[PDB]
Amino acid sequence: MRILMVGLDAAGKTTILYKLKTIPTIGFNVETVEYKNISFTVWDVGGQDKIRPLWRHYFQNTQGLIFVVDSNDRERVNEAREELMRMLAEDELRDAVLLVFANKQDLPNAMNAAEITDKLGLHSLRHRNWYIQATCATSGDGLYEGLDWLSNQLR
Amino acid sequence: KTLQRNRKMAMGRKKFNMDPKKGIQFLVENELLQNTPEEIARFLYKGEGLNKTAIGDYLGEREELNLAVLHAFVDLHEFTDLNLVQALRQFLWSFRLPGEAQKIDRMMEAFAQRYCLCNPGVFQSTDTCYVLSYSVIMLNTDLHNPNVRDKMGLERFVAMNRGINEGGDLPEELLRNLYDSIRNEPFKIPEDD
Numbered sequence: 001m002r003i004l005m006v007g008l009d010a011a012g013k014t015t016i017l018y019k020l021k022t023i024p025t026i027g028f029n030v031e032t033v034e035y036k037n038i039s040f041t042v043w044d045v046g047g048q049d050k051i052r053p054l055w056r057h058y059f060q061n062t063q064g065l066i067f068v069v070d071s072n073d074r075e076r077v078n079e080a081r082e083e084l085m086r087m088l089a090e091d092e093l094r095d096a097v098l099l100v101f102a103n104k105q106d107l108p109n110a111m112n113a114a115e116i117t118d119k120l121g122l123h124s125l126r127h128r129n130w131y132i133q134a135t136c137a138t139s140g141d142g143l144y145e146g147l148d149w150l151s152n153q154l155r
Numbered sequence: 156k157t158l159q160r161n162r163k164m165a166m167g168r169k170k171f172n173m174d175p176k177k178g179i180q181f182l183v184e185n186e187l188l189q190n191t192p193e194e195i196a197r198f199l200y201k202g203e204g205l206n207k208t209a210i211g212d213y214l215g216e217r218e219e220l221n222l223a224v225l226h227a228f229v230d231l232h233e234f235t236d237l238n239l240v241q242a243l244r245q246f247l248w249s250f251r252l253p254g255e256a257q258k259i260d261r262m263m264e265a266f267a268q269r270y271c272l273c274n275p276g277v278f279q280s281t282d283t284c285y286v287l288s289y290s291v292i293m294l295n296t297d298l299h300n301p302n303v304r305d306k307m308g309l310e311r312f313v314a315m316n317r318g319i320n321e322g323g324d325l326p327e328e329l330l331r332n333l334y335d336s337i338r339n340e341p342f343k344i345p346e347d348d
């Protein structure tokens with residue numbers, strides 16, 4: 001919750017959390033962990049626009065946003081961009097630090113970090129503290145380098 | 156011919172539990188189920204030998220067939236004279252709610268249309284009903300999923316729903332009644348049959 005992790009289905013969010021890492025409850029599949037004394041929670045963006053107003057109070061303590069993208073997924077990169085931008089438009093996340101995990105860099109034909117940067121529009125985010133990190137969530141490569149940057153931005 | 160049809164029926168249900176699509180495909184090809192959303196939903200609704208998590212998984216697919224089944228399945232429920240939580244407790248016993256927000260969303264909107272039809276005049280629009288219903292699913296997860304560290308008080312819940320009523324607020328007592336219901340009794344985990 002102090003850090004939120006967002007990304008399209010199949011980006012690798014659950015995979016990353018198992019790197020950082022039960023009783024039945026009806027409801028949302030909450031994934032959360034404490035890492036280095038900071039709470040990280042996957043925030044599932046899968047509903048309609050209409051239910052986003054309900055979210056607001058939850059983001060009051062949120063200081064950082066991890067955005068995870070499947071770098072091998074050229075057909076959905078624009079939809080990822082639109083989601084990132086939706087999240088960055090939340091009033092309560094105005095000052096949130098942004099870390100982008102350019103994930104699935106192990107795949108032979110994945111877009112590189114420079115291309116992902118262009119396509120997610122990071123260069124247009126002139127008043128935002130952001131960083132992009134190349135990652136392979138299955139092997140763990142790049143994850144801790146990105147989290148270390150984010151850690152340090154929080155103070 | 157009767158012991159034989161019963162054996163095919165039992166096999167269809169087993170195949171449904173493993174792979175909903177495939178089990179429905181087996182039933183339809185073997186002439187034990189009409190291939191219409193209405194007849195499939197009637198087969199699922201209180202169906203003996205069907206795993207409620209399979210039922211939920213099947214109802215939560217995005218394919219148009221499944222969305223039509225979902226609406227006909229919602230249509231089987233009787234929500235008249237119930238408050239929202241009481242109606243949700245009935246709906247959510249019929250199948251295991253998936254965990255993905257996209258699916259919960261679509262299911263709450265479908266539930267909403269029938270809630271309002273059963274109870275005209277309780278809410279001013281179906282969207283108000285749908286957003287409130289979704290906030291109840293959030294409240295049940297918030298309160299009763301132990302991974303959620305800090306829980307909403309009443310006051311957070313009333314505040315979350317500010318403005319959902321076509322710009323305005325619902326009466327505080329209606330929200331409090333929903334909050335207290337969920338606080339003292341989580342949605343039950345459904346059991347098969």
Ligand SMILES: Nc1nc2c(ncn2[C@@H]2O[C@H](COP(=O)(O)OP(=O)(O)O)[C@@H](O)[C@H]2O)c(=O)[nH]1
Binds near residue numbers: 009010136137
């Ligand atoms: N090739 C490869 N696969 C990955 C990577 N990260 C995750 N995956 C796989 O991608 C799929 C979706 O990952 P998951 O963590 O479930 O995505 P989620 O929907 O964002 O939680 C799974 O099959 C993962 O094993 C990666 O860096 N490289």
Ligand SMILES: C[C@H]1CCC/C=C/[C@@H]2C[C@H](O)C[C@H]2[C@H](O)/C=C/C(=O)O1
Binds near residue numbers: 001041
């Ligand atoms: C702090 C808790 C509160 C539980 C209720 C919140 C549910 C969110 C609703 C959002 O549409 C998807 C869920 C979103 O993924 C929330 C994850 C989570 O851990 O949230």
Ligand SMILES: [Mg+2]
Binds near residue numbers: 013014015
């Ligand atoms: Mg996941």
